[PDB]
Amino acid sequence: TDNPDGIDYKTYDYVGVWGFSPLSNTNWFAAGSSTPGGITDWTATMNVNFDRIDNPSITVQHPVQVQVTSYNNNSYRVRFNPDGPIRDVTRGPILKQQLDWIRTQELSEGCDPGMTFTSEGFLTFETKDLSVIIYGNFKTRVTRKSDGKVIMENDEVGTASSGNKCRGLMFVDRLYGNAIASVNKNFRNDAVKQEGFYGAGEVNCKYQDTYILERTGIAMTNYNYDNLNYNQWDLRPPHHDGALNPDYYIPMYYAAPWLIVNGCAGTSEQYSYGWFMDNVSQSYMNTGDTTWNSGQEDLAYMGAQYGPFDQHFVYGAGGGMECVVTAFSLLQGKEFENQVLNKRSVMPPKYVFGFFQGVFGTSSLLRAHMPAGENNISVEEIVEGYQNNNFPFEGLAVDVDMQDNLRVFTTKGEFWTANRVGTGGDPNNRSVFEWAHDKGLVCQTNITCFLRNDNEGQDYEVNQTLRERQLYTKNDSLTGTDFGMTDDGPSDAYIGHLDYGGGVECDALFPDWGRPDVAEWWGNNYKKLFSIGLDFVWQDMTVPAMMPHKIGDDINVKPDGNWPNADDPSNGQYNWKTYHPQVLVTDMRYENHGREPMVTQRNIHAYTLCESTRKEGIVENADTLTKFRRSYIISRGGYIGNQHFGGMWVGDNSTTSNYIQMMIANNINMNMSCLPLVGSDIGGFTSYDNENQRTPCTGDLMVRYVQAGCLLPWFRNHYDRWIESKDHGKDYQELYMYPNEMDTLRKFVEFRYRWQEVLYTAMYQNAAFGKPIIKAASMYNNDSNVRRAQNDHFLLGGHDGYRILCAPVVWENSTERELYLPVLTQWYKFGPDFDTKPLEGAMNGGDRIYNYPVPQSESPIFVREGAILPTRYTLNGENKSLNTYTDEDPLVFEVFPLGNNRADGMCYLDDGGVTTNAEDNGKFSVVKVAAEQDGGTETITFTNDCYEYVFGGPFYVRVRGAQSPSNIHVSSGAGSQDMKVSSATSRAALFNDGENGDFWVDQETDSLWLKLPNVVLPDAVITIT
Ligand SMILES: OC[C@H]1NC[C@H](O)[C@@H](O)[C@@H]1O
């Protein structure tokens, strides 16, 4: 029952953008004519006649489904299968059940798209703000009702005499290939529309000497790769000479066949649509690139190596790029599961927003058990360095160093206190994670799906049971390709090789995900790490990142660095650093559908892997977790939709200015691809100094690395550490190892910790409403200058999520930057200094300042007028981990100067993920706040959308720019008292000794502080006279 659909697989190898050319037309079919095929529910069918562009007398018939997916959010969907019947996926971002839920709801509200065919056979329908006509050859024209402006239309190619063929729908003749494609008109060079293409996940793009946000005029591919430094040599163009730089035509770790189009930007007629081709074979997005004749300036396309063809167009409910992102998250939502909290993504435990240090190259938990080796370091020493210098420090990412000789799910004796492996909870022999708990830390460990196979007698229960229950990927293929064999076997198993450099390597077996039982089995292994204290998950080598291998060499032998190349191609022998593309893996896209060669679904392996860890690991064994029941996953690769499993770090970056640039750009682009909780390794993972690899990050690059990343969602300093036993990496990178910059380093980490609720609320808003935490400058509407500023300017936070403006310095040894403040609003310079001094005057939005001064101790960060920001301090004044905070450590609602005599605020509150009752039982609180001025009276109002988590400690209002009132009155459900001046005269005295109902005139920071009881938080009217 392998290969149910009778497909002949024509390509297995990596076909770069340079070899993908649907606009060529040769051997390609495109829609030439149709007749109507009925409408059931909201899915129309058109019976489309496809014609070979370069000889239209050759024609085939395939039905194409046209389904409206949301009336209120203006999204519909084209879908056909060139190779067989149209099939609903059973795994992926877009599920039928969620589409059904959305439709059923909008139908109950009497939404009517009025899908109809005309006399002529043209399908017409309408969404809320748009109307669509699709002609005979499937020519498509999408119009916005309010101004009658055509916002999107697909491409038509002419023939000699056979009429116009719609490249809106294309597939390669199956006598010659398997590729699909879809082409639109591209208005990038229109004088008025100036169309720009955004999104596309982790892709990097250089312009002159700089890494930029926009993705216009370039040819990209998704092909999840083990792409160290984002510029792997085998990923080079044909006949490329000299250094390969990271750039647009190089795949990354995450697969985002997703672009958001933006035209007429910063004007009253702005339009925005998202474009999603839902395919997990190698996929392409060309946004008007003439290089290698892969595209044409005036066309834009998407395509893939394999079928099926299934594509979403998503315009959003209303104005602006951001609205495209939230509508997209809804098609991917879990509303049909009745998720009270996790609608658009899964909420992490709060601790995920803390500062982590990871290291590849620790050799024990405690010093007393650290083996001798040049530059060896213990987990304990890192903890000390951070803790003793009073860093706000959350915990560790313990690498494969911890494992027993690379046996995933195991530990070795050195990573325990008593130097032997225990089964857990013995107060006389604590695991790394347990010991880490007592320091008030939480931990991830590295988990790959590489199940070591060369075991030299030594028993490994995980690889063993996989063999026994036949849950491994078999060594079958439709080509008779010999994947290699060892003396360990099994005979019919795919045996890959894991290689970490410097002779640290092993043979592996892998989970055949598509099988029943594999996910359950996978997930039940995590029991072995949860019961010894493991907090969350660091998913890695996800492709799987297998050692480069050429068919016909021993499993442990990799090819010459230079192979394959254009003169000496792969010709079906290279494994492109994962499974050899021909291996028959059990279908991951369609359950109980059979086996298919991996080439078909490369870009879904990591998704599935994350999926299984989240549902069979983290959720099913939630009981085996120790200190915190909720958990998370930081994954290296995945697909669109991966946000219901957890977040991402952007694999192996390096330690240069360019990589700071890229980090910010990846973060912005990843967010808008519906993956909010993402970030890059702070300081850069790999070595950078070509004369000596062990040279650590400089202090000025680390400062700027820290400052750019300090408000991004995932904040982990991680690096490859040179040790004697693994001789690649840098000497160190930990923040405390930078004595000259230590004070700045630490204060920017404090600053983040004070604004932990700003992060957390932003994440709630993402889980409930799909808003991206990080906003591109171009998401700010009615500004025609944010576009030029979009490489390094980004926003977040507050009630709307556009209250904080960041513009980090992105070059080393630099103390100026060109600053642009978004127009029609005011900004206030802020940062780690400003907690303890008054604000400077207001800065006028719409300002361009060249050479804006940014000394090293500073980053550019502004809080908008009308912002009220939930802010947290420690009661005792010392820096501690977020995960050891209680409600007694103050909440403070910082009221910034009023905008239009108004300010606004939002705080999500829950236990932090100690339990799972916020996402399971709706046990959480949303507090909102407002401030208004009206002559001599200011009114501060607390309301709740719901109050199901009880904030057990006193909270504060910090009014900036106010001093001594004549009276403050508080009104509340069970309270109505006038406030009295506190006999405390310092913030520290107010926190610890101040009375519920005290106020304090802070002259030092020009703020008035109200201390209020915990029970007035869900509802209050505070009036300042
Ligand atoms: O597992 C070792 C190593 N693998 C590659 C990952 O990107 C890196 O973060 C990790 O340290």
Ligand SMILES: [Cl-]
């Ligand atoms: Cl990966």
